[PDB]
Design a protein around this nucleic acid. Structure first.
Ligand SMILES: [Mg+2]
Ligand SMILES: [Mg+2]
Ligand SMILES: [Mg+2]
Ligand SMILES: [Mg+2]
Ligand SMILES: [Mg+2]
Length: 112
RNA sequence: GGAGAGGAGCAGGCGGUCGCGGGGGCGCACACCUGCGCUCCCGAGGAAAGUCCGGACUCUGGAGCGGGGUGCCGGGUAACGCCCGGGAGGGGUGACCCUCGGACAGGGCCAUAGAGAAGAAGACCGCCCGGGGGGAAACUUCCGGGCAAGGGUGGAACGGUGGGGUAAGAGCCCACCAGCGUCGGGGCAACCCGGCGGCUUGGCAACCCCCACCUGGAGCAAGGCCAAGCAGGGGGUUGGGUCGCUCCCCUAUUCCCCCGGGUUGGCCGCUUGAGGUGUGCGGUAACGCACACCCCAGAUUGAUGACCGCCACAGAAUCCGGCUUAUGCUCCUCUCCCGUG
RNA sequence: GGCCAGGUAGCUCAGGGAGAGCACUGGAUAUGGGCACCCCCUAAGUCCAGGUGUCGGCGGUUCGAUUCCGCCCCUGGCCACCA
């Protein structure tokens, strides 16, 4: 859903500068009110996370978590998900349910 | 069965619940442009990779030189540094694998060790001949002369080993070998086979080079179009005109260089191509030709996931031809070895 | 996606027969200290002695490669339109 996909080239700077942030050991989540009746997701994966296979797997998991849980995630925010060094350190050791739990714990705390 | 060499295919599938990307069809709104909404088709790789080569395709005004690349020979191809076939040299018992022009066109470099390393250089331990001297003799000692044959030194010592010939010795002569010069035969050829013959005189060209062939430079962030928006200023014996050098077609600010500020939107390029698959024919083969069938990702923060159930390596970003590296199996050949019918 | 650089003692940096600087380990000795000297402890410093490496890895050429010729690994940078 590309209507659900927020542009990063223009908006990342604005969200970084004007928005809020939440984090845990695996993710940093940046967010800002978008003035819409729905939320939009963006993913920023640092080059150092790895090659296409690895980065694309992470992005797919994140997109899926967001899509399936859209109903419970707060509405009216532009959201940027950033994986942390730790995650890229035990990514192969971290299962899907753990990534889901850790990401949702942050997403559900987006206020207000 | 064991050990090993060559090579070909696949990339966990099929049946279920949801979620994407591009086309098509439809539901509709269309006073234009176009704007949404919901089923059929297709949807990452053998390496998509590293960016090591070769193109195709774009933009830079001409030519020459320099520079760079390839290196036995013959084909194949759009082309190549690739592939196929064949010839020498080497390794392995063997199937097989690895190597590749020229050092009497020239210049330069060979440390250390060693008597001596490019004109034929050299006498260290030594070998033999002719005298003077000492000494009973063995042996020593001085002068003159003859050796590259033994040993030592090396990565290599100016042909190798065996015999004859020598005072003692050398292709001095002879044998087989290696090299070179020729004559004759067979190959398009690289080169092979046989005969004759003085006796022959380092290595490195992944150092410059010589010979033969090939070659501008950038790269899809190439380049073309539209929309949006701020803010211009300082320079040019001229400089710049897609690497350098030298001759040459220009252009004078509108061009180029430096500093500063505006976008950091959308469309084209963007996928049908030296393109796959199935035969038939030619060719030792790589591969070519002929007909038929197919349309096989075109994203732009970048599309393939999760749960269930019987059994790796890693993700297109302009696209092809190859190389190299990373990696899980399965099958087909051939070689050697132990054991049996 | 493409185009370039660089990898050298622990760190910064030189350059076809492996070096400087910071630096580390010792010995010397207080004008520091147990008290005030004797005796002894500790070295910020100052003397001196050195300690030391797959040349980023793996192969080839060569008698020998930091230098030459190939691949692989790691660390950085550059590109688009407007005027
Ligand atoms: Mg059996
Ligand atoms: Mg690539
Ligand atoms: Mg890459
Ligand atoms: Mg000799
Ligand atoms: Mg440009």
């Amino acid at each position: 859903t590309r209507r659900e996909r927020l542009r990063l080239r223009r908006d990342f700077l604005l969200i970084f500068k004007e928005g809020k942030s939440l984090q845990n050991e695996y993710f940093v989540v940046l967010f800002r009110k978008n003035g819409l009746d729905y939320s939009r997701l963006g993913i920023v994966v640092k080059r150092k996370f790895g090659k296409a296979t690895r980065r694309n797997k992470l992005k797919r998991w994140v997109r899926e978590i967001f899509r399936r849980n859209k109903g419970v995630i707060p509405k009216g925010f532009d959201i940027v998900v950033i994986p942390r060094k730790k995650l890229s350190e035990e990514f192969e050791r971290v299962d899907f349910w753990t990534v889901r739990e850790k990401l949702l714990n942050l997403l559900k705390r987006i206020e207000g």
